[PDB]
RNA sequence: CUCGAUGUUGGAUCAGGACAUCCCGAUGGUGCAGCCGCUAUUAAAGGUUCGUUUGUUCAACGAUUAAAGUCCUACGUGAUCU
């Protein structure tokens, strides 16, 4: 179909390279990631009635992986696609006129330059992590008498309430 | 306590505030509305 | 005409005094439901060569989604569903008393 | 508009009217007459 | 009554007022010696909101309250029927009296809320947000005061604060 | 046509109930005799199963029928097997009518009769108080003597009249 | 102590549970718990409120019937209230005297 | 209930006070004997 | 009845569908409906102990009715849990939000604070439209009375009920009415 | 209430809340031309500086800022510190 005005289009899923600077004609400095596309296919295909949602969705997935490692339930549905397993899938929102056919491969080209885009992953695992890395809390001094309290949180609440509010930030996984 | 003169309106014995309600002040109410005979 | 109630659910009611005034009678046979007011019973509910066997269509669920779906079927909690300890199980009355 | 428990209508221009639940004083020859009920 | 027709001929405006069919009150009122329509029928605390066959009568075309020195009402029926009305309004039971619009207007989808009984103009009332103690509790007015006096059929009173 | 307390209908003009118009007592006395006598037929010619009937029994009611037991909480000054009547029916009540008394009905209307099988006591009922930081602790035990009867037949005579 | 104290609410508890059984069964015909009570008393019923949801479980066409005969004294008794005393008493509304 | 009705009507408020259903006796031999009379 | 015993203790306790049309309905009339039968409270049989509620169906809850400014004046407060997570909208913002959660919070503060209540509410089916799933459709038994008697609009009048009630006053024929 | 103990100022750390608003938003009045102000209505999402002396809270002073708000929270917070 052709483009229409509202209409939503699928996404893709890339391997993050590295990161690399370009120059402007007006001499100034853009560092860009390189997003390289290893072999994106649609998976499936979930109308708007069946979605549960007020889009329909259709799925990609990225980048092959081993079958000797993927569940059996995995496994025979990439046997019916005809295609080996993927490591990522993702969900995409669609309009109608935006629906491919599961089993059709997705390209770098798919998107253009001047286009905005917006880029979902996971963050680097910091594991545990005290307030000071984690919030940006300040901390307590080097010295002037300070007792085994230099990285630490501090007040975590009033006295009168007798508890500590869901959502305080505290020392966690990062 | 309080003195028997105040300078607010003091609370009043429930017993007492029971005898006041009881004792209000009901007007003649006549059968026909006045303003609706000639 | 008149009626205390109407008498077209449970039963014709018919109240009198005796003579003497002392004894209320009531009078009161059932009504039966009327043939008209009836739905008939649903009773109604190959070349295949190999014998048609059973197939075992019960997979074993787990506990959360077992238990989704008692609850759904019964319209009852999760709760209901979870187990107790031995300090209960054990406390139950076995052998309980019983009336006719 | 100052906020008033008492209004008062300050010459022959000003008018009263109750709008959104309470009363104001408006007046288009001295708007400085203009007045809220508080 | 009396209707007025503007009619622009030739660039030139002609204002003619005609004598259209008017209305004769019943005949033989129960009650003679009544001073006003409502207590000649013996209508006194015996009519509400929802009476509008009784309210239709004493409104204009657009939903308009009309004089007292026209109807005849004193002044304490004519306040309980302008109350009526403004309740048989909000309430939707005057579907053909509604506000005249200007050619050009066509009002803006409005989210409608059924409603009874409502005292207030929905525009100009604000949300409870502090409710109150018991001793103190901050009531939703229902219904008018000036109906007070109907009359109750049954052994609670009612009920005007929510 | 209009009378002098006409009042237009209106939501209020009249009462929200409806208007009842009951029998006229002339005619209800004849109505009322029917019944009476039908139901009196169906006591002489037997169509009737099983009877109940509530009795008023050591200040209480018990609605009993043939072949019940019923606890009684004191003693009654009677040897076991002895049979006795229960002399104070509220009610008789059939499968296809019932007869009520006010508040009793008559003797010779109906008859209950009920036997002594068991004259014991109840279990140990405990009777204890408390009241904190007074010193104050007491334990009593008391078991009430009971009697238990069986009804052994209800039975009804026609004396509606 | 509890359970001392207990002899009290369980009287108190079950006539409670009467007067719910007999108000859902006074529903079932239209009537009201207070009306059913209250005009039995006036036709010299004396039966007492556990009977009354022993019938209602398992008596329901005595219970109707007794329904009946408290919506007909009532009924009577809005005549009677309505009428300047021209009326004779109601057929169920005699009392019976006792001396 | 009705404890203002039976007063009206010259009776005991309490059905439990005066009249048959209490002061009655509550039962008698079968063969007709008259109980002996209750202590209440 | 002559039953056999199971056959009677099944019959007796049986889960009874009942429906309820919402419409021009003030919700609390609609809940103080809804709550007796969920508890089971309008049968004989009646005990806390013995989960004899039944199904109360409730249908056109996006039609109901408040009297007076409810609309405007009612509040329905909640809380997050997080600092600043006081919620408080008006009963005209949480039913456009939510066509049943007005029926369907007067219903839950009805029934007893215990922790029967949430087991009863698995027995009530709200449904903001007159579309009902053909599951629950099929198994309805009775159809409840509506609490409140909707009141007719001057158009809805026959003329027989408009020439009926009399011309109550002449207007002056010279008036511009 | 607590002396068979409820650790006592200011600061650090982290702040939750009120609005009687210091700044930012929207309005009425003005002895509001404009630029700046004054006063009132509405608004608590967001923000509300760094230093010299003093243990200080304050205060004075220097340099800034759209602004350097007023309060409550056991004069918030020592089983976190000083
Ligand atoms: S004079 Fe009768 S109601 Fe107005
Ligand atoms: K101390
Ligand atoms: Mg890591
Ligand atoms: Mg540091
Ligand atoms: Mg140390
Ligand atoms: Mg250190
Ligand atoms: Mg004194
Ligand atoms: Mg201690
Ligand atoms: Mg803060
Ligand atoms: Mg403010
Ligand atoms: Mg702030
Ligand atoms: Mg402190
Ligand atoms: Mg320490
Ligand atoms: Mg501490
Ligand atoms: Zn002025």
Redesign the pocket.
């Known amino acids: 179909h052709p483009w229409e005005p509202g209409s939503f289009r699928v996404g893709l899923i890339a391997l993050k390279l590295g990161m690399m600077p370009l120059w402007t004609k007006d001499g100034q400095k853009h560092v860009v990631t390189l997003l390289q596309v290893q072999d994106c296919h649609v998976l499936k295909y979930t109308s708007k009635e069946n979605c549960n949602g007020k889009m329909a969705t259709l799925s990609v997935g990225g980048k092959t992986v081993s079958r000797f490692r993927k569940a059996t339930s995995i496994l025979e549905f990439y046997r019916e696609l005809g295609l080996p397993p993927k490591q990522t899938v993702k969900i995409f929102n669609i309009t109608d006129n935006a629906a491919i056919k599961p089993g059709t491969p997705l390209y770098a080209a798919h998107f253009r330059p001047g286009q905005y885009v917006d880029v979902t992953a996971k963050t680097i695992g910091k594991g545990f992590q005290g ?1 000071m890395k984690r ?7 080097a010295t ?6 230099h990285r ?10 007798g508890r500590v ?1 869901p959502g ?2 505290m020392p966690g996984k990062m | 306590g309080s003195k028997a003169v105040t300078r607010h309106r003091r609370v009043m014995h429930f017993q007492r505030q029971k005898l006041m309600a009881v004792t209000e002040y009901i007007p003649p109410k006549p059968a026909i509305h006045p303003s609706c005979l000639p | 005409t008149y009626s205390p109630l109407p008498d077209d659910y449970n039963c014709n009611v018919e109240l009198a005094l005796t003579s003497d005034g002392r004894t209320i009678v009531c009078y009161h046979p059932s009504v039966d439901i009327p043939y008209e007011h009836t739905k008939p019973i649903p009773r109604p509910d190959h070349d295949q060569v190999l014998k048609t066997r059973l197939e075992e269509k019960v997979e074993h669920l787990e506990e959360g989604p077992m238990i989704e779906q008692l609850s759904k079927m019964f319209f009852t909690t999760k709760h209901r569903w979870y187990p107790h300890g031995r300090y209960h199980r054990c406390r139950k009355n076995l052998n309980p008393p019983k009336d006719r | ?3 008033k428990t008492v209004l008062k209508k300050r010459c022959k221009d000003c008018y009263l009217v109750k709008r959104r639940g309470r009363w104001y004083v408006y007046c288009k020859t ?5 007045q ?1 009920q ?1 | 009554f009396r209707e007025v027709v503007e009619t622009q001929e030739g660039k030139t405006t002609i204002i003619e007022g005609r004598i259209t069919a008017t209305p004769k009150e019943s005949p033989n009122p129960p009650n003679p010696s009544g001073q006003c329509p409502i207590c000649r029928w013996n209508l006194k605390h015996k009519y509400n909101y929802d009476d509008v066959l009784l309210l239709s009568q004493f409104i204009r075309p657009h939903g308009g309250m009309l004089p007292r020195k026209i109807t005849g009402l004193c002044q304490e029926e004519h306040r309980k029927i302008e109350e009526c009305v403004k309740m048989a309004h909000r309430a939707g039971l005057l579907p053909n009296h509604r506000p005249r619009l200007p050619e050009g207007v066509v009002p803006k989808s409005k989210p409608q809320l059924n409603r009874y009984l409502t005292r207030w103009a929905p525009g100009s009332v604000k949300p409870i947000y502090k409710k109150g103690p018991r001793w103190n509790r901050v009531r939703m007015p229902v219904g008018s005061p000036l109906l007070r006096d109907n009359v109750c059929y049954s052994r609670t009173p009612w009920k005007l604060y929510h | 046509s209009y009378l002098p307390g006409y009042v237009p209908k209106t939501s209020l003009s009249s009462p929200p109930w409806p208007e009842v118009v009951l029998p006229d007592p002339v005619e209800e006395t004849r109505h009322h005799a029917e019944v009476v006598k039908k139901v009196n037929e169906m006591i002489v010619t037997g169509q009737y199963g099983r009877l109940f009937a509530v009795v008023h029994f050591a200040s209480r009611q018990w609605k009993v029928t043939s072949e019940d037991l019923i606890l009684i909480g004191n003693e009654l000054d009677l040897a076991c097997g002895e049979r006795i009547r229960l002399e104070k029916v509220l009610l008789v009540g059939a499968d296809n009518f019932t007869l009520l008394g006010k508040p009793l009905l008559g003797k010779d209307l109906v008859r209950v009769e009920a036997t002594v099988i068991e004259k014991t006591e109840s279990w140990p009922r405990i009777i204890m108080r408390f009241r904190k930081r007074k010193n104050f602790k007491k334990k009593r035990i008391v078991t009430t003597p009971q009697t238990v009867l069986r009804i052994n037949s209800i039975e009804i005579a026609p004396c509606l009249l | 102590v509890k359970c001392t104290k207990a002899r009290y609410l369980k009287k108190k508890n079950m006539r409670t549970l009467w007067i719910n059984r007999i108000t859902a069964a006074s529903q079932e015909h239209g009537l009201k718990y207070p009306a059913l009570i209250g005009n039995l008393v006036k036709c010299q019923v004396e039966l007492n409120r556990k009977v009354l949801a022993d019938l209602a479980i398992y008596e329901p066409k005595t219970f109707k019937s007794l329904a009946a005969l408290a919506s007909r004294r009532r009924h009577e008794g809005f005549a009677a209230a309505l009428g300047d005393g021209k009326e004779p008493e109601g057929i169920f509304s005699r009392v019976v005297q006792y001396h | 209930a009705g404890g203002q009705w039976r007063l009206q009507q010259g009776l005991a408020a309490n059905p439990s006070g005066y009249g048959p259903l209490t002061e009655l006796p509550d039962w008698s031999y079968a063969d007709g004997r008259p109980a002996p009379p209750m202590k209440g | 009845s002559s039953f056999s015993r199971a056959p009677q203790q099944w019959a007796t306790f049986a889960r009874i569908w009942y429906l309820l049309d919402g419409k021009m309905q003030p919700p609390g009339k609609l809940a103080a409906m809804a709550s007796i039968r969920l508890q089971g409270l309008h049968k004989p049989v009646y005990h806390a102990l013995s989960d004899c509620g039944d199904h109360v169906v409730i249908m056109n809850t996006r039609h109901i009715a408040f009297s007076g400014n409810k609309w405007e004046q009612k509040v329905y407060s909640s809380h997050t849990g997080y ?4 919620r408080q909208v008006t009963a005209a913002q949480l039913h456009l939000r939510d066509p049943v959660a007005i029926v369907k919070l007067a219903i839950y503060g009805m029934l007893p604070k215990n922790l029967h209540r949430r087991t009863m509410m698995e027995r009530l089916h709200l449904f903001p439209d007159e579309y009902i799933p053909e599951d629950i459709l099929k198994n309805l038994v009775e159809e409840l009375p509506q609490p409140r008697k909707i009141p007719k609009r001057l158009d809805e009048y026959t003329q027989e009920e408009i020439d009926a009630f009399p011309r109550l006053w002449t207007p002056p024929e010279d008036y511009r009415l």
């Open positions: 307030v919030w940006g809390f300040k901390g307590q001094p002037h008498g300070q007792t085994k309290t630490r949180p501090g007040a975590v609440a009033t006295g009168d309430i509010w305080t930030k | 508009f100052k906020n001295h708007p400085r007459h203009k809220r508080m | 600092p600043g997570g006081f």
